[PDB]
Short mmCIF file of all heavy atoms in Angstrom, two decimals:
data_model
loop_
_atom_site.label_atom_id
_atom_site.label_comp_id
_atom_site.label_asym_id
_atom_site.label_seq_id
_atom_site.Cartn_x
_atom_site.Cartn_y
_atom_site.Cartn_z
N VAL N 70 -58.57 110.45 86.01
CA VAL N 70 -57.58 111.47 86.28
C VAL N 70 -56.20 110.86 86.61
O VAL N 70 -55.19 111.27 86.07
CB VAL N 70 -58.05 112.45 87.38
CG1 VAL N 70 -56.93 113.36 87.93
CG2 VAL N 70 -59.17 113.34 86.84
N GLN N 71 -56.17 109.82 87.49
CA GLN N 71 -54.92 109.14 87.81
C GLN N 71 -54.34 108.41 86.57
O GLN N 71 -53.12 108.39 86.42
CB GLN N 71 -55.16 108.13 88.95
CG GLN N 71 -55.57 108.77 90.28
CD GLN N 71 -54.63 109.90 90.78
OE1 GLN N 71 -53.43 109.88 90.56
NE2 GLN N 71 -55.16 110.88 91.48
N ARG N 72 -55.18 107.86 85.72
CA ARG N 72 -54.81 107.10 84.50
C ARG N 72 -54.47 107.97 83.27
O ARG N 72 -54.13 107.41 82.23
CB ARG N 72 -55.84 106.02 84.27
CG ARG N 72 -55.46 104.79 85.08
CD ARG N 72 -56.60 103.85 85.38
NE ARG N 72 -56.12 102.71 86.16
CZ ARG N 72 -56.66 101.50 86.25
NH1 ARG N 72 -57.91 101.26 86.08
NH2 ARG N 72 -55.89 100.51 86.56
N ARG N 73 -54.49 109.32 83.35
CA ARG N 73 -54.14 110.18 82.23
C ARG N 73 -52.70 109.95 81.72
O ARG N 73 -52.44 109.97 80.52
CB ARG N 73 -54.39 111.64 82.59
CG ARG N 73 -54.25 112.59 81.40
CD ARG N 73 -54.79 114.00 81.66
NE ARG N 73 -55.04 114.76 80.41
CZ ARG N 73 -55.16 116.06 80.29
NH1 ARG N 73 -54.92 116.88 81.29
NH2 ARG N 73 -55.52 116.58 79.15
N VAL N 74 -51.78 109.69 82.66
CA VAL N 74 -50.37 109.39 82.33
C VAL N 74 -50.29 108.06 81.56
O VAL N 74 -49.57 107.98 80.55
CB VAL N 74 -49.48 109.39 83.58
CG1 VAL N 74 -48.04 109.01 83.25
CG2 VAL N 74 -49.47 110.76 84.23
N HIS N 75 -51.06 107.05 81.95
CA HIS N 75 -51.09 105.73 81.27
C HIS N 75 -51.63 105.88 79.83
O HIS N 75 -51.11 105.26 78.94
CB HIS N 75 -51.88 104.74 82.13
CG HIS N 75 -51.34 104.66 83.52
ND1 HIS N 75 -51.61 105.56 84.54
CD2 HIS N 75 -50.31 103.83 83.94
CE1 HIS N 75 -50.78 105.25 85.58
NE2 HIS N 75 -49.97 104.23 85.22
N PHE N 76 -52.66 106.76 79.63
CA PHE N 76 -53.21 107.04 78.31
C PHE N 76 -52.15 107.71 77.37
O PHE N 76 -52.23 107.55 76.16
CB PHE N 76 -54.41 107.98 78.46
CG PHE N 76 -55.76 107.30 78.57
CD1 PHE N 76 -56.59 107.60 79.67
CD2 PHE N 76 -56.21 106.45 77.57
CE1 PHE N 76 -57.90 107.06 79.73
CE2 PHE N 76 -57.51 105.91 77.60
CZ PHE N 76 -58.35 106.24 78.69
N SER N 77 -51.18 108.44 77.91
CA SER N 77 -50.13 109.12 77.13
C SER N 77 -49.34 108.22 76.19
O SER N 77 -49.08 108.62 75.06
CB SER N 77 -49.19 109.93 78.04
OG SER N 77 -48.20 109.10 78.66
N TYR N 78 -49.01 106.99 76.60
CA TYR N 78 -48.29 106.00 75.80
C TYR N 78 -49.18 104.95 75.16
O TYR N 78 -48.76 103.82 74.90
CB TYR N 78 -47.08 105.47 76.60
CG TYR N 78 -47.37 104.90 77.95
CD1 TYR N 78 -47.89 103.59 78.10
CD2 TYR N 78 -47.04 105.63 79.12
CE1 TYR N 78 -48.10 103.05 79.39
CE2 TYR N 78 -47.22 105.08 80.40
CZ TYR N 78 -47.76 103.80 80.54
OH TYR N 78 -47.88 103.23 81.76
N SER N 79 -50.44 105.33 74.86
CA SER N 79 -51.44 104.46 74.18
C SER N 79 -51.00 104.04 72.78
O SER N 79 -51.65 103.16 72.18
CB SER N 79 -52.83 105.15 74.20
OG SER N 79 -52.77 106.47 73.67
N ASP N 80 -49.98 104.64 72.17
CA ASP N 80 -49.42 104.26 70.89
C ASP N 80 -48.59 102.94 70.96
O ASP N 80 -48.32 102.32 69.93
CB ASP N 80 -48.59 105.42 70.30
CG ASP N 80 -47.35 105.84 71.12
OD1 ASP N 80 -47.33 105.62 72.35
OD2 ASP N 80 -46.42 106.40 70.51
N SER N 81 -48.16 102.55 72.15
CA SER N 81 -47.36 101.33 72.39
C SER N 81 -48.17 100.02 72.13
O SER N 81 -49.41 100.01 72.16
CB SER N 81 -46.76 101.34 73.81
OG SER N 81 -47.74 101.30 74.82
N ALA N 82 -47.46 98.94 71.87
CA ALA N 82 -48.03 97.59 71.63
C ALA N 82 -47.03 96.46 71.95
O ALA N 82 -45.81 96.70 71.93
CB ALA N 82 -48.50 97.53 70.18
N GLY N 83 -47.54 95.26 72.18
CA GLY N 83 -46.72 94.09 72.54
C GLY N 83 -47.45 92.77 72.27
O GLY N 83 -48.62 92.76 71.85
N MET N 84 -46.72 91.64 72.42
CA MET N 84 -47.29 90.28 72.22
C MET N 84 -48.40 89.95 73.22
O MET N 84 -48.34 90.39 74.38
CB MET N 84 -46.16 89.24 72.21
CG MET N 84 -45.55 88.96 73.58
SD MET N 84 -44.63 90.33 74.36
CE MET N 84 -43.16 90.45 73.27
N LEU N 85 -49.39 89.16 72.79
CA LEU N 85 -50.53 88.73 73.62
C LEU N 85 -51.14 87.45 73.08
O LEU N 85 -51.05 87.14 71.88
CB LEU N 85 -51.55 89.89 73.62
CG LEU N 85 -52.78 89.72 74.56
CD1 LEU N 85 -52.37 89.60 76.01
CD2 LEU N 85 -53.68 90.95 74.43
N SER N 86 -51.85 86.69 73.92
CA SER N 86 -52.59 85.44 73.63
C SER N 86 -51.75 84.28 73.02
O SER N 86 -52.18 83.58 72.13
CB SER N 86 -53.86 85.77 72.81
OG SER N 86 -53.57 86.28 71.49
N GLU N 87 -50.58 84.03 73.60
CA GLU N 87 -49.65 82.94 73.14
C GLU N 87 -50.15 81.55 73.63
O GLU N 87 -50.34 80.63 72.86
CB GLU N 87 -48.24 83.28 73.57
CG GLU N 87 -47.17 82.19 73.30
CD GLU N 87 -47.05 81.79 71.84
OE1 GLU N 87 -47.38 82.59 70.92
OE2 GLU N 87 -46.54 80.67 71.56
N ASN N 88 -50.39 81.43 74.95
CA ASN N 88 -50.88 80.20 75.63
C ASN N 88 -52.32 80.35 76.16
O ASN N 88 -52.68 79.80 77.18
CB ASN N 88 -49.89 79.78 76.73
CG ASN N 88 -48.50 79.44 76.24
OD1 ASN N 88 -48.32 78.74 75.24
ND2 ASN N 88 -47.47 79.85 76.90
N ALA N 89 -53.15 81.19 75.51
CA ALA N 89 -54.51 81.50 75.92
C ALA N 89 -55.48 80.30 75.95
O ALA N 89 -56.37 80.26 76.80
CB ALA N 89 -55.08 82.58 75.03
N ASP N 90 -55.35 79.29 75.09
CA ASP N 90 -56.26 78.15 75.02
C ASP N 90 -56.33 77.38 76.37
O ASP N 90 -57.40 77.28 76.97
CB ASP N 90 -55.97 77.23 73.84
CG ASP N 90 -54.59 76.56 73.77
OD1 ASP N 90 -53.63 77.08 74.38
OD2 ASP N 90 -54.48 75.50 73.13
N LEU N 91 -55.18 76.83 76.85
CA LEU N 91 -55.20 76.10 78.12
C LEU N 91 -55.54 77.00 79.30
O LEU N 91 -56.28 76.60 80.19
CB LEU N 91 -53.86 75.34 78.30
CG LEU N 91 -53.89 74.29 79.42
CD1 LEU N 91 -52.96 73.12 79.11
CD2 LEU N 91 -53.48 74.83 80.81
N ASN N 92 -55.06 78.27 79.31
CA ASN N 92 -55.34 79.21 80.37
C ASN N 92 -56.90 79.44 80.46
O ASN N 92 -57.45 79.40 81.55
CB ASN N 92 -54.57 80.54 80.13
CG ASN N 92 -53.14 80.53 80.67
OD1 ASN N 92 -52.93 80.49 81.86
ND2 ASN N 92 -52.13 80.48 79.83
N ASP N 93 -57.59 79.62 79.32
CA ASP N 93 -59.04 79.80 79.29
C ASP N 93 -59.79 78.51 79.72
O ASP N 93 -60.74 78.59 80.50
CB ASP N 93 -59.52 80.24 77.90
CG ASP N 93 -59.08 81.67 77.48
OD1 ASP N 93 -58.59 82.46 78.32
OD2 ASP N 93 -59.33 82.06 76.32
N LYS N 94 -59.37 77.31 79.23
CA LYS N 94 -60.01 76.07 79.63
C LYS N 94 -59.84 75.80 81.11
O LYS N 94 -60.77 75.39 81.80
CB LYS N 94 -59.51 74.86 78.80
CG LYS N 94 -59.87 74.91 77.28
CD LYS N 94 -61.28 75.43 76.97
CE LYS N 94 -61.55 75.30 75.44
NZ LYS N 94 -62.86 75.84 75.09
N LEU N 95 -58.62 76.06 81.65
CA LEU N 95 -58.34 75.92 83.08
C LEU N 95 -59.16 76.95 83.86
O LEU N 95 -59.71 76.60 84.94
CB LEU N 95 -56.81 76.04 83.27
CG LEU N 95 -56.33 75.95 84.74
CD1 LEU N 95 -56.84 74.71 85.47
CD2 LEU N 95 -54.80 75.87 84.70
N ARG N 96 -59.33 78.17 83.39
CA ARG N 96 -60.16 79.19 84.02
C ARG N 96 -61.60 78.75 84.07
O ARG N 96 -62.30 78.94 85.05
CB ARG N 96 -59.95 80.54 83.32
CG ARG N 96 -60.67 81.70 84.05
CD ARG N 96 -60.40 83.06 83.41
NE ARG N 96 -58.99 83.46 83.48
CZ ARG N 96 -58.41 84.42 82.76
NH1 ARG N 96 -59.08 85.25 82.01
NH2 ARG N 96 -57.11 84.58 82.81
N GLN N 97 -62.10 78.11 83.00
CA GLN N 97 -63.45 77.55 82.97
C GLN N 97 -63.61 76.43 83.98
O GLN N 97 -64.58 76.39 84.73
CB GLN N 97 -63.83 77.13 81.54
CG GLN N 97 -65.22 76.49 81.41
CD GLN N 97 -66.36 77.39 81.88
OE1 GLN N 97 -66.93 78.17 81.11
NE2 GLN N 97 -66.70 77.39 83.14
N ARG N 98 -62.63 75.49 84.09
CA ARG N 98 -62.66 74.43 85.10
C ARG N 98 -62.64 75.02 86.52
O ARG N 98 -63.30 74.53 87.42
CB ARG N 98 -61.51 73.40 84.91
CG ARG N 98 -61.75 72.48 83.73
CD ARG N 98 -60.82 71.27 83.71
NE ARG N 98 -59.39 71.63 83.55
CZ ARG N 98 -58.75 71.81 82.39
NH1 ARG N 98 -59.35 71.73 81.26
NH2 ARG N 98 -57.48 72.02 82.40
N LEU N 99 -61.89 76.11 86.71
CA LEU N 99 -61.85 76.82 87.98
C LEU N 99 -63.20 77.48 88.28
O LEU N 99 -63.65 77.41 89.42
CB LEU N 99 -60.68 77.82 87.93
CG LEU N 99 -60.60 78.77 89.15
CD1 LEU N 99 -60.48 77.99 90.44
CD2 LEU N 99 -59.42 79.69 89.00
#
């Protein structure tokens, strides 16, 4: 119910997973 407003702009998009390799390997070491 609180997230219904967030669902309204579900048509939007943006950049993702640019530096994911080192972030994931560092997360695994963590």
